[PDB]
Design a protein around this ligand. Structure first.
Ligand SMILES: CC(C)CCCCCCC[C@@H](C)CCC[C@@H](C)CCO[C@H](CO)COCC[C@@H](C)CCC[C@H](C)CCC[C@@H](C)CCCC(C)C
Ligand SMILES: CC(C)CCCCCCC[C@@H](C)CCC[C@@H](C)CCO[C@H](CO)COCC[C@@H](C)CCC[C@H](C)CCC[C@@H](C)CCCC(C)C
Ligand SMILES: CC(C)CCCCCCC[C@@H](C)CCC[C@@H](C)CCO[C@H](CO)COCC[C@@H](C)CCC[C@H](C)CCC[C@@H](C)CCCC(C)C
Ligand SMILES: CC(C)CCCCCCC[C@@H](C)CCC[C@@H](C)CCO[C@H](CO)COCC[C@@H](C)CCC[C@H](C)CCC[C@@H](C)CCCC(C)C
Ligand SMILES: CC(C)CCCCCCC[C@@H](C)CCC[C@@H](C)CCO[C@H](CO)COCC[C@@H](C)CCC[C@H](C)CCC[C@@H](C)CCCC(C)C
Ligand SMILES: CC(C)CCCCCCC[C@@H](C)CCC[C@@H](C)CCO[C@H](CO)COCC[C@@H](C)CCC[C@H](C)CCC[C@@H](C)CCCC(C)C
Ligand SMILES: CC(C)CCCCCCC[C@@H](C)CCC[C@@H](C)CCO[C@H](CO)COCC[C@@H](C)CCC[C@H](C)CCC[C@@H](C)CCCC(C)C
Ligand SMILES: CC(C)CCCCCCC[C@@H](C)CCC[C@@H](C)CCO[C@H](CO)COCC[C@@H](C)CCC[C@H](C)CCC[C@@H](C)CCCC(C)C
Ligand SMILES: CC(C)CCCCCCC[C@@H](C)CCC[C@@H](C)CCO[C@H](CO)COCC[C@@H](C)CCC[C@H](C)CCC[C@@H](C)CCCC(C)C
Ligand SMILES: CC(C)CCCCCCC[C@@H](C)CCC[C@@H](C)CCO[C@H](CO)COCC[C@@H](C)CCC[C@H](C)CCC[C@@H](C)CCCC(C)C
Ligand SMILES: CC(C)CCCCCCC[C@@H](C)CCC[C@@H](C)CCO[C@H](CO)COCC[C@@H](C)CCC[C@H](C)CCC[C@@H](C)CCCC(C)C
Ligand SMILES: CC(C)CCCCCCCCCCCC[C@@H](C)CCCCCCCC(C)C
Ligand SMILES: CC(C)CCCCCCCCCCCC[C@@H](C)CCCCCCCC(C)C
Ligand SMILES: CC(C)CCCCCCCCCCCC[C@@H](C)CCCCCCCC(C)C
Ligand SMILES: *C\C=C(C)/C=C/C=C(C)/C=C/C1=C(C)CCCC1(C)C
Ligand SMILES: *C\C=C(C)/C=C/C=C(C)/C=C/C1=C(C)CCCC1(C)C
Ligand SMILES: *C\C=C(C)/C=C/C=C(C)/C=C/C1=C(C)CCCC1(C)C
Lengths: 222, 222, 222
């Protein structure tokens, strides 16, 4: 359509759509309770991402925010996505290591603060304060990874699986704050169609790529 | 008042109001833990519905959406209702059969997608895409019922009670997509005051009627 | 800045900020699972309050609502705060007494109704109905305290700790409906900068003061 980034919003829609169906079909048969939990959490992520990617493609998940003497197109639907999918992804990691709820509660709530403050920053009409919310949001992210590393006798199937997904999680997640900072939301460096491509490549890897590495392992069974 | 559908918004308010009070009083005494769970979930549903029905009566839960060359009155407060009351209703059914959390997590999250995509459809300004969100929302509904039927050795008190409420649940819930499709939200076939009556009759049966059949049985005790 | 209440929004920001850091540092070391739960819930409260207090200071968590022939400044960010922090505070009390989930589910859901109806009232454009939502919201509050008192063999460390926090909870919480009624949201009696001071003093006591009395006791360990 009229927006150059349309193609990446369409490709993301498409890829999130087929990953859900792939994980749906694969969960066909599963009766192991715990396996039943990873399949639930992991199928719902691109399911949710699917709808939010489609709401961006179709124009609904977009809004104008004025600042720097311009009217900026901001896709708020990403934060409706992450708000639910990022604790679900952290949920996947925690269950995996059998995290006590005290740690789960800090992960989920720090996660909500990260996204919520991510969202406020995205919609704030005063240019410099946008970067204050980013920083707060980055401290929550930097908190989660900390617990991801020093916040946790596991079976060696869960460990390796865990180490794999923890590194894939730090590398992709830590790229989101960078992308936002240089993109349309912040400094206006990287064009909106390139950032939409970066977020698409990260989203698909963080959800479907993350999902294929997880459900492909016996780490999920009890 | 000025809106013809006012009378059904007032009758729903009223009926949701007295069902909460009826279930509140009835839970007076209950000390059985599990009974304590069905009473919690089941009292909260028309409690929440009460407030959302009243916000519609008083005008707050309503907004204009433009499309088809008209300004359409859309009651968004229904989705604030369902978003919380429909997982609670599915929660009632699951606990009842002692569903593993893997199934509960898929039910609740598929439910959120159904309502959330229901909501996006309701507020989308491009007429044909309204029907795309409906369809997605109907696939999630059709998913839940599937699990409602083929997604689950229970005591025979829970089974019969369960079968009763599962059929009452498929019959009423499956009517909501029909009503939306022919009503103000979609094709503009059935007038807004008639749809408001249909949703009122379904809501009251799905919550209070569903609640009286459930808490009236010993299926709820352990 | 230009708003006289700025100073109290800045002082609250500041105090919520240092209480989080204080509780964060203190949770450093903790490995007792249950202790890990009170520290999670209790650190997140002024953490969340911090962000919401800052969004009010910076102007984002504020909006104009017209009524009584005036344009009223309403800080909606308080309800984004409470919506998450008040069930967390009730969560702290319940875990403490080892509440069955039936009671927890009624507490959290009655709490959501209190805040949600608090919020609707705050944004309602018809002056008298504002007071209807308050009343409904006060019935939910009056419900929670009821369960706080007659809705529950505990260790005597939890009891005393519990009694302490239950009284501090009834006294501060019951003051919020009073403040709203006489402030900018309702009758327009107490000026906005004084109410912002009252809510600040209550918020800080209800969260950080409440937090220091709680985590300072061995009531939290198993
Ligand atoms: C927990 C524990 C942790 C809590 C986190 C603490 C920080 C929370 C901050 C939050 C505050 C919410 C921001 C938002 C409501 C402000 C709305 O105003 C916007 C900008 O003024 C209006 O823009 C116009 C467009 C608007 C776009 C933004 C809307 C977005 C909505 C996404 C939510 C989705 C939920 C799916 C519901 C169905
Ligand atoms: C960040 C701290 C760690 C935490 C405290 C949060 C508040 C501080 C925000 C960081 C800085 C924000 C100040 C932006 C300032 C340079 C504005 C630039 O001036 C231009 C005209 O006046 C802005 O117009 C338009 C020109 C623009 C392209 C300017 C873009 C500004 C950039 C901001 C980058 C912030 C990152 C360094 C944070 C990495 C640490
Ligand atoms: C965006 C990609 C990096 C593109 C660059 C490709 C080359 C670098 C690939 C990064 C990968 C690093 C992961 C390696 C890990 C392997 C070791 O695992 C250890 C097992 O004991 C885990 O303990 C300790 C584990 C430690 C691993 C932490 C990972 C690091 C985090 C790097 C953040 C990312 C880049 C930050 C954003 C950037 C894209 C601007
Ligand atoms: C989980 C797991 C599953 C997640 C589901 C995935 C799909 C989520 C999609 C959601 C997106 C939210 C839609 C909404 C925020 C868009 C708001 O913009 C409206 C239309 O442009 C503005 O209309 C103007 C009026 C507005 C009316 C709509 C608001 C409604 C709010 C209802 C929420 C209530 C919550 C009670 C809070 C107290
Ligand atoms: C639905 C698929 C299964 C899933 C894919 C989702 C996208 C397809 C949506 C279904 C169709 C939507 C197309 C509507 C189209 C007939 C528009 C009608 O033309 C009129 C003037 O151009 C619309 O103005 C106003 C006149 C109106 C009264 C027209 C109302 C349209 C009706 C749509 C009914 C859709 C139901 C069949 C779906 C049941 C399956
Ligand atoms: C069936 C499955 C997905 C359906 C395939 C899609 C068909 C797309 O073809 C193009 C027709 O011109 C849509 O782009 C035309 C441009 C316009 C944008 C329309 C794109 C959306 C129609 C694509 C979203 C898929 C929908 C999913 C229908 C609900 C599904 C869950 C049953
Ligand atoms: C809206 C009402 C139907 C009004 C019409 C009244 C006449 C038809 C009443 C429907 C009722 C059907 C329920 C019967 C059930 C009884 C069998 O129970 C079985 C026990 O083994 C359950 O297994 C298998 C159970 C199977 C039962 C599934 C129920 C069917 C679902 C029908 C959906 C509804 C109508 C769809 C919307 C419509 C209103 C446009
Ligand atoms: C559970 C179980 C219990 C459920 C409780 C039942 C009662 C629920 C009622 C709720 C309804 C929501 C009210 C709100 C969505 C209405 C929005 O319209 C406002 C006034 O017309 C628009 O004002 C313009 C500004 C707007 C300001 C209000 C927005 C606020 C948003 C706070 C939410 C935050 C969540 C953090 C998300 C990230
Ligand atoms: C409250 C019931 C228990 C539950 C039912 C809820 C609906 C009843 C709301 C209580 C009352 C509301 C009626 C307000 C009415 C006095 C309006 C005052 O008249 C003035 C001009 O007409 C209002 O303009 C501006 C002048 C203003 C300063 C008027 C402020 C009105 C005050 C309302 C105070 C309500 C508290 C008594 C409720 C304590 C019980
Ligand atoms: C006490 C219980 C419910 C109270 C009864 C109601 C009284 C309605 O009488 C009419 C006065 O003209 C209201 O309609 C007049 C038209 C206007 C609409 C007002 C309707 C609302 C006032 C009805 C909602 C009930 C309220 C609940 C008060 C809170 C309760 C939980 C304590
Ligand atoms: C706002 C402050 C009150 C300022 C006034 C300072 C003087 C009064 C201090 C209030 C304090 C009362 C708490 C005492 C308690 C001590 C007894 O504990 C009992 C142990 O068995 C608990 O059982 C039973 C416990 C019972 C205790 C319930 C507390 C009462 C609730 C009072 C509500 C508050 C004031 C209402 C709002 C006001 C600020 C307008
Ligand atoms: C295992 C199978 C069935 C996978 C296909 C399911 C559908 C969706 C795509 C899943 C594949 C992607 C791998 C995850 C990791 C990433 C680095 C992908 C980034 C996106 C770029 C697109 C290139 C590959 C694809 C078109 C599959
Ligand atoms: C069991 C007692 C105490 C019930 C009364 C509580 C208050 C509210 C109404 C509950 C009754 C409704 C039965 C549920 C099923 C439905 C098919 C009702 C659809 C609505 C139509 C109204 C007709 C009946 C009523 C006015 C009670
Ligand atoms: C125990 C220590 C480390 C406390 C300091 C942490 C930082 C924030 C403030 C915490 C102290 C407040 C006590 C809680 C109860 C209240 C009645 C406070 C109401 C607010 C008024 C401000 C006066 C005191 C303070 C500046 C500490
Ligand atoms: C779709 C899932 C991922 C896993 C998306 C994760 C995104 C982030 C981790 C976001 C962090 C951001 C920060 C830290 C800085 C402000 C802006 C963001 C919200 C993009
Ligand atoms: C009040 C409780 C019920 C139990 C309301 C349930 C409503 C539905 C199940 C909604 C489904 C819809 C679909 C499937 C299609 C789009 C529009 C709806 C959201 C009404
Ligand atoms: C920050 C935490 C506290 C503990 C804030 C609690 C606030 C209340 C308990 C609110 C109740 C209100 C009622 C009962 C009346 C309508 C307006 C309020 C939402 C302020």
């Amino acid at each position: 359509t009229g927006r150059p980034e349309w193609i990446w919003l369409a490709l993301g829609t498409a890829l999130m759509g087929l990953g859900t169906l792939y994980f749906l079909v694969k969960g066909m048969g599963v009766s192991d309770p715990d396996a039943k939990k990873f399949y639930a959490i992991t199928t719902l992520v691109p399911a949710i991402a699917f709808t939010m990617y489609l709401s961006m493609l179709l124009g609904y998940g977009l809004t104008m925010v004025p600042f720097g003497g311009e009217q900026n197109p901001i896709y708020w639907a990403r934060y409706a996505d992450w708000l639910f999918t990022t604790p679900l992804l952290l949920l996947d990691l925690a269950l995996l290591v059998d995290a006590d709820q005290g740690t789960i509660l800090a992960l989920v709530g720090a996660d909500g603060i990260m996204i919520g403050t991510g969202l406020v920053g995205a919609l704030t009409k005063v240019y410099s304060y946008r970067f204050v919310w980013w920083a707060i949001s980055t401290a929550a992210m930097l908190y989660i990874l900390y617990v991801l590393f020093f916040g946790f006798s596991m079976r060696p199937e869960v460990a390796s699986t865990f180490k794999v997904l923890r590194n894939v999680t730090v590398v992709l997640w830590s790229a989101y704050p960078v992308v936002w900072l240089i993109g349309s939301e912040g400094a206006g460096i990287v064009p909106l169609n390139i950032e939409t491509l970066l977020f698409m490549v990260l989203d698909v890897s963080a959800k479907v790529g993350f999902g294929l590495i997880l459900l492909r392992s016996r780490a999920i069974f009890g």
